[PDB]
Symmetry: C5
Subunit: 310 residues, 5 copies
Amino acid sequence: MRYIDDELENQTILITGGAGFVGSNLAFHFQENHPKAKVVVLDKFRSNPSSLGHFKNLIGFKGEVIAADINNPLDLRRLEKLHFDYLFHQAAVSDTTMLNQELVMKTNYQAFLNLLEIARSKKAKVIYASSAGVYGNTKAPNVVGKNESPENVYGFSKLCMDEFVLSHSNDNVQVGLRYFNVYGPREFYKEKTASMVLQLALGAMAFKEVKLFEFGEQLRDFVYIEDVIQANVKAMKAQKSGVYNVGYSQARSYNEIVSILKEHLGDFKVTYIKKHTQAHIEPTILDLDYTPLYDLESGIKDYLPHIHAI
Amino acid sequence: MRYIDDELENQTILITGGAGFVGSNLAFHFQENHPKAKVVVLDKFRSNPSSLGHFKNLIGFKGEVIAADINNPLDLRRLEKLHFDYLFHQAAVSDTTMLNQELVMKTNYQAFLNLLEIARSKKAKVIYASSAGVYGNTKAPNVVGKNESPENVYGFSKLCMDEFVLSHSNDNVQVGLRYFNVYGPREFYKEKTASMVLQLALGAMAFKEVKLFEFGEQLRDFVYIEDVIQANVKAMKAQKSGVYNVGYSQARSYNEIVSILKEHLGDFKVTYIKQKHTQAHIEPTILDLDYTPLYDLESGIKDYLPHIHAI
Amino acid sequence: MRYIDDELENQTILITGGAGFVGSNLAFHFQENHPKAKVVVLDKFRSNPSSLGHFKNLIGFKGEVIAADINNPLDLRRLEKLHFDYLFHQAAVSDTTMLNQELVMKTNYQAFLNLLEIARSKKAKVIYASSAGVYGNTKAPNVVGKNESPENVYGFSKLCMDEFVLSHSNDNVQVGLRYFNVYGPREFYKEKTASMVLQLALGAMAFKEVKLFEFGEQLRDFVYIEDVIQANVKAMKAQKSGVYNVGYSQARSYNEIVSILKEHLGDFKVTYIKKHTQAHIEPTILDLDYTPLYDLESGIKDYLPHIHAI
Amino acid sequence: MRYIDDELENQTILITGGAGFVGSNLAFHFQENHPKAKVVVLDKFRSNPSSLGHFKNLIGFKGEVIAADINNPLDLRRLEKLHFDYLFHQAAVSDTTMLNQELVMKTNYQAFLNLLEIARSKKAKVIYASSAGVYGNTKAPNVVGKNESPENVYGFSKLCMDEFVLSHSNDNVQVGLRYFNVYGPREFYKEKTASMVLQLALGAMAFKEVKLFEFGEQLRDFVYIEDVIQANVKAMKAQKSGVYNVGYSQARSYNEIVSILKEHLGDFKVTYIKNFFQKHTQAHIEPTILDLDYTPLYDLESGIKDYLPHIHAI
Amino acid sequence: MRYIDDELENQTILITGGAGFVGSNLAFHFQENHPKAKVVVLDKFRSNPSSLGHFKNLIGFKGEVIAADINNPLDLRRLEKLHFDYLFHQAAVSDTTMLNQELVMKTNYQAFLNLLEIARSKKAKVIYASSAGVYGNTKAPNVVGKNESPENVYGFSKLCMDEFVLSHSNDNVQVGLRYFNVYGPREFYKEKTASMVLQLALGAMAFKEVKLFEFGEQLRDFVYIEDVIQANVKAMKAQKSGVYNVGYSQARSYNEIVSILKEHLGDFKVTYIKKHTQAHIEPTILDLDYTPLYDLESGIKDYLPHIHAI
Ligand SMILES: NC(=O)c1ccc[n+]([C@@H]2O[C@H](COP(=O)([O-])OP(=O)(O)OC[C@H]3O[C@@H](n4cnc5c(N)ncnc54)[C@H](O)[C@@H]3O)[C@@H](O)[C@H]2O)c1
Ligand SMILES: NC(=O)c1ccc[n+]([C@@H]2O[C@H](COP(=O)([O-])OP(=O)(O)OC[C@H]3O[C@@H](n4cnc5c(N)ncnc54)[C@H](O)[C@@H]3O)[C@@H](O)[C@H]2O)c1
Ligand SMILES: NC(=O)c1ccc[n+]([C@@H]2O[C@H](COP(=O)([O-])OP(=O)(O)OC[C@H]3O[C@@H](n4cnc5c(N)ncnc54)[C@H](O)[C@@H]3O)[C@@H](O)[C@H]2O)c1
Ligand SMILES: NC(=O)c1ccc[n+]([C@@H]2O[C@H](COP(=O)([O-])OP(=O)(O)OC[C@H]3O[C@@H](n4cnc5c(N)ncnc54)[C@H](O)[C@@H]3O)[C@@H](O)[C@H]2O)c1
Ligand SMILES: NC(=O)c1ccc[n+]([C@@H]2O[C@H](COP(=O)([O-])OP(=O)(O)OC[C@H]3O[C@@H](n4cnc5c(N)ncnc54)[C@H](O)[C@@H]3O)[C@@H](O)[C@H]2O)c1
């Protein structure tokens, strides 16, 4: 479903982290909705921890690929040969093994700045993925510009990306997107770091039993992969730089998932064991015409068929 | 046997992966059939897993060699000094130890793109080896453009090669060749990844007994190394880019091998042990490259068998 | 609190080791006190030993970051793209794991010389951190120019920094600052190498018991992080190169800390187990208008609230 | 003993693998016989397998050395600063640990091509060491151009060197020399890969007993290090590229060594051992004589005789 | 004590291996005797085997340092930025762990040639350290040009240095100095490879007992560090290239040390356990005006006070 009535006729779209969850979904959206645009996906491609990209997420991709590591000078230098009109920077490190603090900064921030430089020279608009992690454990709703107190390097690295584009808001049109607990197709290969809806839904379908921490009633703003996609494409029409929250702007408990899940998968065991996010989405709507569809229900509904692929 | 009535008189032919199975066979074909052409073979040469090229496969080669690693910038930069008219890209990674996903892509795809760039600048026609692996476990017959759902990185990497040349069909004349279970001389050093005909034929000749999975009646389109060669040389007359299936277009069971094998090696034990089906849709290849495979599993096993006797 | 009535309006301030103790504190001072100045922090960012920088020390930073390793030619080359007016070189190696002698010299001295070269070309004033370690075990008070007999590589490396700027006092305005046992907020992540006031105060607050070597009456010139900050900002108005001692110029025993500590945290155990520094601060005062506030008391007082964050 | 009546007065001679057996002997020959020529020896210098070069082989060398690895771009780039008139490429890998196939090709062939390129640009004549290994187990006599079927990478790599210069016979004057079982002074440090005459003569002198495979009557064309030297110096007057066999052109059994050896060292034990397993080499030397004026002296006898005094250095 | 009545007023002196024994002593000589000259010391600085340089040997150095590895292209390339008038090449590998043959050649010879190239371009006179090791076990006296049959790589590498400068005697003024068993202050950190006078004198002062091989009456030409220094400074006035022996030209047995030692430290045990060098110094005297003072006696005498620093 087109999110902008632009043909993107002779445009070249570069998606880094294209073998990953959002990157691959995004690449497919353009493939199906703007068949005239050139979609080129770039990715390191699963190093095994570290990069959890996977060719399985690109199974029906008819565009082109670039096997590259954004930290590799040679690869970046070669990337300058490519003429692209847009850059959707989705490539980053898996929080799973985010051990070393210096390395998370290298690939999540340092590498980013370099892509910014290349995009600016090519006067290609930039749309990048930030994170709701920039807020750390602060009071919800989470508003951009307020209480961004990361609790881990990964969250901090993302904050640095934003603090940078904000400081350089006129170097080029650069739009940061802070995602909040995204779920949907193609997140399976993120392994243990795949969404809880994917986690729960799978435990239910498998062991017919599902584990969940202390009452699992903690609230997270779950945004469906489709709305995240809408955000990226809407963002490419931005005539000014900025960083926006991108969630459904409605928090839901892990229990409500289990619930909406039972309402589909029937009943299952709810074994326990012994933070609050909600996207303030106003400016996003205001600036990007963003308008999320898919609440946890519409989301879990649309996603569930794929989850059945067992 | 000439597959094109061209002399290839002052042409320089570059064959990457020339120390490997098809590359070495190909190099010899040109050597014997187009003696006027300059055949230059390039290869990393067996690193031990990884590259399974082997000088034994070039024992009677009178042309020239280039010891190089296609992933090595210095080697590639040095390769630009060479003026070649054709590039047969056969160099790739052994599915045997295809462990790391990032590395398969580096050498099978990234390295490929760079060769593409060099060939284009030198305006040298490109003929490269793809794989039937791009189809994964989909319904046979396998048609280019349909149901290409790789199941492993190796298959995917090959698909990326094709998806690229198709997107750049006018940058230069680039012809991809999707091989299906190739067998024939010089595949011995591929070790455990050598064709089943070579595997079975050897077990029979040795232990007089042969193992084989669940009834071994699964069908594979076995194409003899000679037809693969025909495909490459026919492909060098292509005036347009494209990717083609290259098999015999006739599936055969592992049992039919055992059969055609007993019909030669006499009888032997058929021990078993406890979901794919390939068959090349070859129409476009015929149509575009004048490809016409000879050698059915019988003619193939027949012609191959004498060499297999070298024990 | 402004330490100079300069607006620093369109100035760019580069702080290396900005993710560390003094660097992060310094970056915040400029942020809060000279909001018009551009504060750019650079750091390797904790490699795990080695670099003990930590994003936690930059939690409220609104300026920009540079993920870089001063020993990396590529990073340094990229750094030349940045136009900065001042360089506060705080980046150095953690004495904790200062094992290899060659490596301490590389990052503490060799890397320093290169920054000197870059700053000189950019005609940017240089203010760097030296150490009271240059004096080794010599008679106190410790006077710059006298009895600088390092006892370890780290101390020596710092000495080389000074012996160099002194030899090149006219290449650019380069000011070295020899710190003496600094304490205060944001030194927690220095782990085992964090100040004794932080060490003792934590043992007291936790185990209600505190260990301390042979009578712990050995004297150290403890200087509060705030005075160190005063020193750096005062130093940026220097019109001539030089190296200065920066302490409170008043030695205090580890017992006096325990004392001033009990006077706050109540009583606690003083278990034992079986060098003398005092900054000669005259020239510093004379040349930089340096005037330390915060004695061990005012220091421990102001610091203690933060230490309570447990 | 001069092998050419040329003074080589202001010539610079570059010998790669100069810390090795033939390279070091060669460097000494020029030192003693053409004292006006500049002899510069280049070598990696024993990495420990791999490179078995050793400073002991250059003990009386008054010329100059270049510590370099021919596979190292930086070293090769620095080598271009040197102006040399001749290049004697003796540097190669020890068959002893020739494990990895890719690596033998890198240093024995790839590295060679680059030296060829540098020599060509400097218009310096090239004389390189090939091997009788290019023939593998084929019928003797071994003739250049016929039955070159290597059995190992090392032999293949050498063949590639030749197939290349032959394809590029006019790029510069490049002369390949296929050595057959060379023996003589300065091969001791090749360890286990030192000639059988050195091996046997040492076992005899030590344990007074000598081991030897299946009857040890298999024939090898043993060429004395001195004739190899004659070949290189004669080769530097070649006005055309080419690859030549360089042996004595007369095969001898390992027993004849033991024999010529007893005739000197007195008697000793001759213990055998068993474990198709056949090879037979004999250099067809005609073209070499024809083109290089090569004329080998030293039969196994004259060879073992002249060599034996040095072997006594125990 | 000045060894040349030249002021060396605006000269820049580069000493490699400056953190080592002779290099550090040399650097101090110029510091004290030619205060007008710029003394810059370069060293890798103890990697732990390998490089046994140590900052302790530069404790009172007021000149400048360069942390560099002569085998590192980047460091050598950076070194070209420095304008120096003289190069005293003292840096080399410790015979102690001289295991790999290829590596000794790399740093002792290959790295040397590169320094030769840089010095030649800068038209800076070169004075380098060779060794009496070039003679191996040949008949004494040891004459330059005769019987140089090294027995180890280290000795050979040194020989190559000389055979090179001799072949290139007109490329620049390059003077090689073949030292013979040098002893004196600042050799302590050479550990087990420190002079026998230092070894014996320490065993005597400590365990009051001293070990010594087969009768310890083997003769070595022991030259005091001060005469070695005289040789280097006299060498910098050479107007022609050449390689010279630099010893006292008088062999002495290890027993004579024990003797001259007892004559000072009183008596001690002489426990045993089960080559001959003598520098032919004529050409050195003739060409460099070299005239050694300090026989084993004057040497042991002058050195002994320092050895007392225990
Ligand atoms: N819950 C969420 O999914 C969520 C929340 C907040 C922010 N984000 C951000 O959205 C973006 C995409 O996340 P995702 O869900 O797709 O994760 P993902 O791991 O599925 O996709 C990211 C891709 O980056 C690739 N990559 C990693 N290192 C690379 C390198 N050095 N060079 C090239 N490619 C490299 C990985 O292989 C992977 O394919 C990120 O920037 C991520 O931090 C996601
Ligand atoms: N059954 C088959 O034979 C079959 C089936 C499908 C596809 N293919 C394709 O055919 C082509 C060749 O197959 P093959 O049977 O010759 O396999 P092979 O193992 O012989 O590979 C050919 C050569 O590639 C060389 N090589 C690998 N990496 C290299 C590198 N980085 N640099 C230089 N050389 C390198 C190896 O040394 C080997 O000599 C490939 O593109 C392969 O994917 C073959
Ligand atoms: N804290 C004291 O009392 C004291 C005493 C004497 C001297 N000093 C000196 O003051 C300066 C700052 O000390 P600190 O208390 O901030 O120590 P710190 O270790 O907390 O901070 C130093 C920062 O430098 C960073 N760094 C290290 N190597 C780097 C590299 N290669 N590239 C980029 N960044 C790198 C570290 O990660 C850290 O963030 C140093 O030069 C230190 O030696 C401090
Ligand atoms: N019987 C024989 O001795 C025989 C027979 C046939 C061919 N050959 C050939 O003769 C030539 C010399 O043989 P050799 O007897 O001197 O053996 P050798 O062991 O002495 O090897 C010669 C030298 O090559 C040097 N070298 C190896 N790799 C190097 C590198 N990367 N860079 C620089 N130097 C390197 C070795 O260190 C050694 O000094 C070769 O080309 C060899 O293959 C010898
Ligand atoms: N001291 C003696 O008895 C004696 C005798 C004969 C020759 N020599 C020669 O005199 C010179 C100095 O000897 P020394 O007694 O001072 O030994 P030393 O080890 O004290 O001095 C050598 C210096 O070279 C430095 N160095 C080593 N490798 C380096 C590298 N890669 N880059 C930069 N610096 C490096 C070491 O750190 C050390 O500081 C040498 O050339 C040595 O071989 C000394």
